[PDB]
């Protein structure tokens, strides 16, 4: 699915299939993703995170 | 060791220990970092990248050619 | 920042700026480094890896899952 | 081809197809290689380096 997120306050979008590492501090879900061959980063409030991304977050937390 | 750069026209400084990824496009060094629970992204010219950051870049590029 | 380890039963110290690659096998942290024109390899338990070296390990593992 | 080399003074061997970065300081040709999914390192005197490895060294020097 598509994730709408901010990086340096700018609105961007990426498919969840590109997402590689996910974590949460307070309301912010931060993640790294494959940005056409190099890493990119994003930030999304937890309330705005799609089901698929929340699933990734909880899996990543289980792996910590 | 601090990396000083411009973030949306504002002067910012980030400790190298906060840097999570670094990449290069020509003379530009792009870095992703932790900032108070968020990820931020900065860019510096290679001349303004501290040696510690350039060493991270060389490791990242070596890891990318391992396969 | 120095990494202190045993190299063929001898006490050795290497500056983190000399480290070229780092990997982990269980609790073992393996690192490849420059030493007077040669590459050497050391191993430390993760408890004896300085935070700077553990940060290099986390970057290497992130670069390995980018693809 | 096979390269016979030393790491921490111990004799090892690896195929040149695994070699990834090559450089030389004095008589020592040092290199990194893919060691079954993680990097390994080696050192070989230039006089003991096979043709294939010397070719890699000169290419790497041209890229510096
Ligand atoms: Cl690094």
Swiss-Prot record, chains B, C:
Similarity section: Belongs to the 7 kDa DNA-binding/endoribonuclease P2 family.
UniProt-recorded name of the protein: DNA-binding protein 7d
Subcellular location: Cytoplasm
Residue positions where N6-methyllysine is found in the record: 4, 6
Record function comment: Can constrain negative DNA supercoils. May be involved in maintaining the integrity of the genome at high temperature.
Lineage of the organism: Archaea, Thermoproteota, Thermoprotei, Sulfolobales, Sulfolobaceae
Temperature-related activity annotation: Hyperthermostable.
InterPro entries: Chromo-like_dom_sf, DNA-bd_7a-e_arc
Protein keywords: Cytoplasm, DNA-binding, Methylation
NCBIfam families: Sul7d
Keyword Cytoplasm: yes
One Pfam family named in its UniProt record: 7kD_DNA_binding
Miscellaneous field: Sac7a and Sac7b are truncated versions of the Sac7d protein, most likely resulting from post-translational processing, or degradation during isolation.
A GO cellular-component term linked to this record: cytoplasm
pH dependence per the UniProt record: Highly stable from pH 0 to pH 12.
PTM summary: Lys-4 was 70% monomethylated in form 7a, 25% in form 7b, and 20% in form 7d.
Single Gene Ontology MF annotation: RNA endonuclease activity
Subunit comment: Monomer.
Principal location class: cytoplasm
């Amino acid at each position: 699915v598509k994730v709408k997120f901010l990086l340096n306050g700018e609105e961007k979008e990426v498919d969840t299939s590109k997402i590689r590492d996910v974590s949460r501090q307070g309301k912010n879900v931060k993640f790294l993703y494959n940005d056409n061959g190099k890493y990119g980063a994003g930030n999304v409030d937890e309330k705005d995170a799609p089901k698929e991304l929340l699933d990734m977050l909880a899996r990543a937390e289980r792996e910590k």
